[PDB]
Amino acid sequence: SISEITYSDGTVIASIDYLYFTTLAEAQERMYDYLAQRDNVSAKELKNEATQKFYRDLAAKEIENGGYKITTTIDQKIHSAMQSAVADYGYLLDDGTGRVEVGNVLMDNQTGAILGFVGGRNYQENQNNHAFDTKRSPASTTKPLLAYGIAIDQGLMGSETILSNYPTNFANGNPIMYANSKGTGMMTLGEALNYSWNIPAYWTYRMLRENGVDVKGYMEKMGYEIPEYGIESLPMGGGIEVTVAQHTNGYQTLANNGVYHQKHVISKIEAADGRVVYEYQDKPVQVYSKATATIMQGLLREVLSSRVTTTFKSNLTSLNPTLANADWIGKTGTTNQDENMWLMLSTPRLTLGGWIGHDDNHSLSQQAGYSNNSNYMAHLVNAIQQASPSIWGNERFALDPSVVKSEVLKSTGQKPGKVSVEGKEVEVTGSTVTSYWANKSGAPATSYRFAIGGSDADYQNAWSSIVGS
Numbered sequence: 001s002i003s004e005i006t007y008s009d010g011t012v013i014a015s016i017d018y019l020y021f022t023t024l025a026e027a028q029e030r031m032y033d034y035l036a037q038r039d040n041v042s043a044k045e046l047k048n049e050a051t052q053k054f055y056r057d058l059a060a061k062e063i064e065n066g067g068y069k070i071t072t073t074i075d076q077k078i079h080s081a082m083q084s085a086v087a088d089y090g091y092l093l094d095d096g097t098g099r100v101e102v103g104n105v106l107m108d109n110q111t112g113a114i115l116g117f118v119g120g121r122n123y124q125e126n127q128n129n130h131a132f133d134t135k136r137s138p139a140s141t142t143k144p145l146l147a148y149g150i151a152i153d154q155g156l157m158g159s160e161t162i163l164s165n166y167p168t169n170f171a172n173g174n175p176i177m178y179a180n181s182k183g184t185g186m187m188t189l190g191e192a193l194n195y196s197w198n199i200p201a202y203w204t205y206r207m208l209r210e211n212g213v214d215v216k217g218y219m220e221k222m223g224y225e226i227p228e229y230g231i232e233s234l235p236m237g238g239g240i241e242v243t244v245a246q247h248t249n250g251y252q253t254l255a256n257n258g259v260y261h262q263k264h265v266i267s268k269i270e271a272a273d274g275r276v277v278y279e280y281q282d283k284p285v286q287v288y289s290k291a292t293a294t295i296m297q298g299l300l301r302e303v304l305s306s307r308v309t310t311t312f313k314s315n316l317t318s319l320n321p322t323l324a325n326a327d328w329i330g331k332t333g334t335t336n337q338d339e340n341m342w343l344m345l346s347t348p349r350l351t352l353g354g355w356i357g358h359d360d361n362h363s364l365s366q367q368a369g370y371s372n373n374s375n376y377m378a379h380l381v382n383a384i385q386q387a388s389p390s391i392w393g394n395e396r397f398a399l400d401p402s403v404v405k406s407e408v409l410k411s412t413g414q415k416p417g418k419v420s421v422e423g424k425e426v427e428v429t430g431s432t433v434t435s436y437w438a439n440k441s442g443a444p445a446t447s448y449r450f451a452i453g454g455s456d457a458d459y460q461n462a463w464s465s466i467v468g469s
């Protein structure tokens with residue numbers, strides 16, 4: 001008898017086109033883990049590199065002879081529908097800059113299982129796996145996990161707090177840029193995400209760094225490896241390289257109300273005589289407070305509604321209005337010189353991550369992320385849809401009970417009151433808004449320095465203008 005890989009229903013993929021090599025590689029890696037433990041009681045010589053080889057190789061052979069049954073997470077019909085979508089629509093990513101590659105991973109928000117993926121436009125013509133092995137910076141999609149998610153979560157801010165987007169410079173003396181802008185004064189957390197302004201993200205991380213929040217603790221809990229957290233542009237996705245698979249897993253976390261389940265493609269390995277060599281252990285972990293996570297899903301639902309940096313919701317509506325009705329949330333990213341684009345989507349029941357780019361690191365059109373990648377993802381989204389009607393779901397994302405609402409002046413994210421404006425102390429009034437907070441006591445009173453970030457010059461022109469009462 002010979003070894004085999006099966007779809008999650010039970011259908012045999014192949015015996016022992018990305019489909020084959022992904023499930024086989026993850027298969028071998030769990031095999032390696034088990035061999036290294038299966039006695040050969042190792043640790044640390046596991047670090048020596050001559051061994052690694054020996055085992056990796058030994059691993060491969062155990063699958064070739066050995067005769068085991070490998071159970072994947074893959075839902076055949078969706079996976080096929082996905083391959084078809086890329087065959088039928090990959091071409092909408094092409095934008096006068098040569099074949100554009102693509103990597104997507106569709107992940108259950110609750111198991112962490114991967115129901116299917118897109119490896120690239122065409123395994124025959126080119127084999128790198130853009131869903132699994134390639135790594136690029138996630139850009140402005142880092143913002144929600146590494147800056148805002150965290151700070152809200154340490155109650156250092158809430159839903160309508162306020163960030164300086166006034167001009168300001170890295171420590172080298174160069175201007176923090178957004179596309180072509182030097183900045184624009186103050187704005188809500190809402191605006192800053194809907195447009196992905198860079199400066200607000202820059203001030204957020206900086207403040208985290210001054211309270212020394214254990215940022216790394218958080219990122220590490222989702223599976224991220226970032227070699228150096230002391231980079232000023234970190235939050236914008238500077239110094240971070242990731243895979244679609246892995247980062248899809250980051251959006252899975254915000255989506256499953258702050259609870260990370262570890263990504264995977266393999267659920268079970270079973271030996272000839274039925275003995276279980278590997279089985280997926282469900283260990284959940286609570287990376288963000290349900291307060292924080294649900295707050296975030298609210299804001300990330302306007303990121304798509306707003307349509308400011310993605311045409312998606314329009315594209316999807318046009319190809320299928322019912323579905324465009326599911327409670328979608330998401331975020332985009334663009335890297336320097338338009339070299340990559342990212343779009344992450346979740347409804348509460350699934351996540352879809354999608355990266356488009358060139359293999360050799362050159363540039364896409366300006367539109368590629370905002371338009372192309374959006375319309376393509378909307379077609380992929382239908383395609384899964386058609387293949388498995390119930391899959392995406394109808395549930396709403398919802399603000400958790402533990403969230404805490406506050407009345408605050410639109411003008412300063414903060415509860416109204418007296419403040420010190422250079423002699424002449426001030427009664428601070430204007431219209432209010434409810435602002436969500438993931439701490440026990442809600443918003444502060446207004447303070448001269450209400451916003452995250454801002455210079456002295458800044459606050460002066462800001463409070464100046466707030467003064468027309």
Ligand SMILES: *C(=O)[C@@H](NC(=O)/C(=N\OC)c1csc(N)n1)[C@@H]1N=C(C(=O)O)C(=C)CS1
Binds near residue numbers: 137178236309335
């Ligand atoms: C977010 O990704 C931010 N982009 C950038 O800061 C930089 N690129 O600008 C052309 C960048 C970030 S990391 C890196 N290596 N380069 C804004 N993101 C979007 C978006 O798609 O949401 C934009 C509309 C353009 S800039």
